[PDB]
Write a structure and sequence with these properties.
The structure is a homotetramer. By secondary structure, chain A is an alpha/beta fold. The first copy, chain A, has 8 helices and 15 strands. Chain A folds into 2 domains: about 220 residues, 3-Layer(aba) Sandwich (Rossmann fold); about 110 residues, Rossmann fold, CATH 3.40.50. Bound molecules: aspartic acid (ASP) (4 copies). The site of one aspartic acid has 12 residues of chain D, from loops. The PDB classes it as hydrolase.
């Protein structure tokens, strides 16, 4: 027996199709159907019995928490089946780290869930999607891949959903985790596992969203010279339950940001101080408002905070989640 | 014999002083005076005739465009003097890239301007500031350092103001330019120059702010799943002239972001699409609203846009500035 | 209350002492005694009951396998004691990755073994050794540090012995593992664990060298354009049991290298093909002579091969060790 | 209208051809002819009038200094012609940095010379060579590419021959210059120049090898724990004129290495201390034997030393070359 893998498609440049091979604008991300991706790499059938299912077909900049919630619920159904050994999810690069991390916290199975994406459309010269998809299927079907949390596979690398991020606007090697590295790499049709993440996920995670149809509102505000108080006022006004702050340095806040945060907290908004820098630890500091994001970047921090707020409003518990998830 | 260097102090953790050597919260950034920094490294007097001038003493997260404008005007006065060979500017790490890039565009001299900072306070065990300051002074006093644009010096590295960024919340090696590298390095008391930036700066820059007392209002908004339209409404409402968008991937915009941007542009707000990723090129795309940031990250892009708006409101000219500065 | 930590000193720039603070040549690495290091950071005594033991005092470029063997044997004696909770080993940066990886494979305890080093001498301005030592002691005394394999601590980072390497000749942030990241980081006097290495080590390792008094001879030969066959001849002639080849690219071998390798193997020399590149996988290739190093760089590969050859001469078993250690 | 570009083919995995699309051993590097590469990307004809010339067809691990000398001589002939605007050289990845740097020092023209390579064979799924070639042709034909020294183009990046190196055995993104960055990047069919190298090359280089038919013999020896003296004896015995030492840390030498080096120097062998670390400066140290490689890695250092020895045996002049080329 080959493993049985479902390829659950959501869209992205991996399913993008353009007029010529050199073209990288004007084409639609999420134009091609899941079977077209599979038929472009017939080699996948030597690795697994694959079945394509079209979940959606959108550019990932339009992916929304309400859709991601349904994606999570669907993956959980699929993995509950005896005839499904793993799932590969095709997705746009722009917000794959948000969807992936969401599933990392909410999927109740040790079976592999592997997000895969492409920086060049399927019609491009030296398109990356075909090899990226092959590698994702190899990963999803290996018995050694079980219990590792949700994975993001591109460019011969296996990244943990919790650490991996799109570090570059436009390159093929954009997905990196500068301080945490890759869980593994795929070279010469062989998987080499290097690390296991030392964080809670999947079957050891408290978060369960089955039955939910929507999520708490969380917005992200940037920190910079002359950052304005009025954006905190606007967020509070629009009923946010959480604000993630993409702070200067180690979550440092200006006098204007401190004023906005204190206002937010008066209204019961939970504030998380993250960093705009790209990497590293925002340490605890009792003198400043809000909780701290540990090493979660702003986009990951929003996902965790949303999920946390489905369960609790207790700052002590939420802070512990940030240190452990 | 020796070069004459002014050390112009603005604050920062480099001037921070705590109760113990292991302490890194509760202490005040910008507590120590410039002469206390100089007297902690008397070795600097073998490199240069140094003179300390206290420009300000704040944490850099509170640095503002109006103050940076005065800093630029002061540096231009200093460099106009025959008895000043270069300037070293002590500053906080959190927004040094913004202040540095501002001076990179507005300083009308080939004499060296070198920003220097520290991630650990002056009282810390293995504090970095002493050696960082020594290196900055060596750089500022070398004849080979002339004509290179504004520099940021920490941890044995010389970064261009246009490329360097704080990449990590909390580490000593935080300042990197992943795609562009360092202008040079300082090893064994010797400067090794590697690159010259291929962009316009200082004496070849069209931007001149002498006589200005304030700058156009420019805000930065983040891109993420479920990003809200109402933050664009708030910005427009508060009279911004420019919005920098810290976009998903290559400046990709959601349907909500597109609606906010189109509204902004109807009111004459100039929109620049940058990236939240940390690195790389946002390419032109005539199908999407706004201009593109080229390789300027959101913080640098705000600075350039502010300065551009002091000279023009022509999108074609502003776009050209983003490709040349 | 506090853990009991032995600080076992071997030398290195961490123990180096120069005539001035800016000096970085002419000084002797491994000049200062272990108690002088401890007394320079009295803060260590709030973290642990420390005891210094002078094992040696040499520059690490002179460290030899016979000495490393004794170091391993000693650490195993120390860790067998009820009154020792962990060991910190002060060492030179140049070959710390070789000594650390040796201990990683031979130390029969889950108690922490933490190597520490410094790129600047103890007398330098902004010397890194004091903070590095303090961090190493924090790591060695934490209960959470147990069972993680041997660690190398510098510059706020905790590297696994198996992955970490000196990547730069002269910088403070030199120790990195580009593909595998750090096991953890130490920020704000707090340890943040990120990864557990997915390889065999310490208490799950087959390698045991207690009672040995010497090791098999293994040399390292470089791969490059016009590489010569006569260096393989010289190695065979001097009785090597193993050759690690620091190959072009993915362990690629010239016609001359193939000839040298075939000669070596005819004499029963075990050949491992590694890479000079710095990073990544050398994949299996039945067409080429020798075994492959997986992701072990040449220095690590020499250590593993030496240890392997104390137990077996079976190529199949040795190759498996390279994929699992 | 279009620039005239010669594509001069030497072999490599870019010209490699395998039995299936997933295969990466058993195939021959340098199997396909230059016209087959060109015809696989007919899009190149919109960028340039291209002409293929087959210089050789070998795996680059077999490239030799005598062949590289001919390659340089041929490129100089081509660039002397009015009907040649630039040259793209197809080559294997394993030693492209050595051949590229050789040309960087010996090519007497400001016209672009661009080396290009591929990590996956031409028959692979998601092969990189087609896009890499197209980018190389774009770079070679752009007027803005003149006067930049020799370039290595892969994966959307333009590296200087002096800084770029294969950092990873097996990945597509392997070519990096960690401290010096890229000269530029190619994104969205547009070239973005970031840096100019601050070193002597091409038209400003003293090295001229036209008329030479062979080069001085230079070998490379590795530095590691227990490194043997007898390899220096072997090298001396075989008539080397130079030895490059791939040293521990900053060119640090063991007692055994010092003895070998002193022996070599007595026989008039020039010794250059480089580093095995991958990056950074080997600083001067008059106490230790030999000259220092500045930031040249061992493979580059061999190239420069060979060329230096064609002109001089004066240590002072050779050392100055290492600081300026
Ligand atoms: N805009 C695309 C970008 C990509 O997939 O590369 C997406 O995220 O759907
Ligand atoms: N908040 C401090 C951080 C530092 O300087 O390291 C500042 O930017 O002033
Ligand atoms: N030569 C020194 C270098 C250092 O420790 O930084 C050593 O390895 O002992
Ligand atoms: N063996 C090949 C490797 C490659 O081109 O990727 C070469 O250097 O010729």
């Amino acid at each position: 027996k080959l493993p049985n893998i479902v390829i659950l498609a959501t869209g992205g440049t991996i399913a993008g199709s353009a007029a010529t091979g050199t073209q990288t604008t004007g084409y639609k991300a999420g134009a091609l159907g899941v079977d077209t991706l599979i038929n472009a790499v017939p080699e996948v059938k030597k690795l697994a019995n694959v079945k394509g299912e079209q979940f959606s077909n959108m550019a990932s900049q339009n992916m929304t928490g309400d859709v991601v919630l349904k994606l999570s619920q669907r993956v959980n159904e699929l993995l509950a089946r005896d005839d499904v050994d793993g799932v590969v999810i095709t997705h746009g690069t722009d917000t794959v780290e948000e969807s992936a991390y969401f599933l990392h916290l909410t999927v109740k199975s040790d079976k592999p869930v592997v997000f895969v994406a492409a920086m060049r459309p399927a019609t491009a010269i030296s398109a990356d999607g075909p090899m990226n998809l092959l590698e994702a299927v190899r990963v999803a079907g290996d018995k050694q891949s079980r219990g590792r949390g949700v994975m993001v596979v591109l460019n011969d690398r296996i990244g943990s959903a919790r650490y991996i991020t799109k570090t570059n606007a436009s390159t093929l090697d954009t997905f990196k985790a500068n301080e945490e590295g890759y869980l593994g790499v795929i070279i010469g049709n062989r998987i080499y596992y290097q690390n296991r993440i030392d964080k809670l996920h999947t079957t050891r995670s408290v978060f369960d969203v089955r039955g939910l149809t929507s999520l708490p509102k969380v917005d992200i505000l940037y920190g910079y010279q002359d950052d304005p108080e009025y954006l905190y006022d606007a967020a509070i006004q629009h009923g946010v339950k959480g604000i993630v702050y993409a702070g200067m340095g180690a979550g440092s806040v200006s006098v204007r940001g401190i004023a906005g945060m204190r206002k937010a907290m008066e209204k019961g908004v939970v504030v998380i101080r993250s960093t705009r820098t790209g990497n590293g630890i925002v340490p605890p500091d009792e003198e400043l408002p809000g909780l701290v994001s540990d090493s979660l970047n702003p986009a990951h921090a929003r996902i965790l905070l949303m999920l946390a707020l489905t369960r609790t409003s207790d700052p002590k518990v939420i802070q512990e989640y940030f240190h452990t998830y």
